[PDB]
Structures are given as C-alpha cells and as structure tokens.
Design a protein around this nucleic acid. Structure first.
Lengths: 71, 70
RNA sequence: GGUAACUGUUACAGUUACC
RNA sequence: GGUAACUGUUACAGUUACC
C-alpha cells in the first residue's frame, strides 16, 4: 500500500472527528455542518477503497496529529 | 454571528494542522489539492468577516483544545 | 463513468454569514 | 439582488490510490 495515502486518510478521519465534536456542541454554522456531511460520506468511501476500519483509522490519525503537534 | 466566527477559527487551526502534515511530506496529492483549495477559501472567508488569519488560528487552537478536553 | 476520493474552470437550485 | 464560503446537481479538463 501507499504510505502517504494511508496517513492522509487517518489524519482526515481524526480531523473529521474534531469537527463533529464542534457540531455536537452546537458551536458551528450551517455550512460547516454541510461540509461535515460531505466529508462523512467521502471517508466511508475511502475507507471501503482502502479496506480500513474508520474507528481504527481515527485513532491512528490522533496519534499522528499528536506526534506532529508535539514537534 | 458567534457560530460563524467559531467555525472560521476552527477551520483556520485545522488547516494549520493539515499544512504541517504536508510540510513533513506525509500526505498524498489530493490532500495537498484540498489544502490549496481551503487556503483560498479561508482567505475569502477571513476577508468577508474582517478577521486576521493568524489571530483566528490561535483562537481556533484554544477552541479545539477546549472541546477535546471534555 | 474501471472503483474510490479529490482539484481547476462553468452553470443551475439551495444553505449560511454580511449589505 | 449583491459579496464570500459552502452543499447538491451538471459540463469540460485533470490529479492521486488501487498488483
């Protein structure tokens, strides 16, 4: 598999999770929710294409983001 | 509108995180394509709202850290 | 339209913010 | 109606992953 393809998917999953948290707290505007919906479907399609569980990918993306932010 | 401003500040900080991934050469070409699209989009939204991008990015960082704290 | 995701340019319908 | 961003749809041209 292509490493940067996987990494990009895992990071994208984690940042979708962060955006969803904002929406769940009623702190985002309507276009932000529209993009959340578009990206939600896109990540499901990418996960199916790569054969990856979305929850596992999210946790991996969390660790990647945390590792970069710490440096 | 507070939710409009909050969404912009968060989007600014999340763009910053994505750009750091790109600068480490850890991302794929479509990820970079979206980074360029969103750079243009945020410039337009920042102009429309009258908000400084550096300051909004710092405020987005605080918001993101606060909602994650829970 | 190979599957999936996306980008640039264009149009329409619409959403949100602002006037 | 306008400015900006976006969502859906569409036209043209592309990018990446997939032995």
């Amino acid at each position: 598999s292509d490493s940067n393809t996987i990494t990009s998917f895992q990071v994208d999953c984690y940042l979708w999770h962060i955006r969803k948290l904002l929406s769940m707290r009623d702190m985002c505007d309507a276009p932000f929710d529209d993009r959340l919906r578009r990206d939600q479907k896109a990540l499901k399609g990418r996960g199916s294409t790569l054969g990856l569980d979305l929850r596992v990918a999210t946790m991996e993306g969390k660790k990647i983001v945390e590792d970069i932010l710490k440096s």
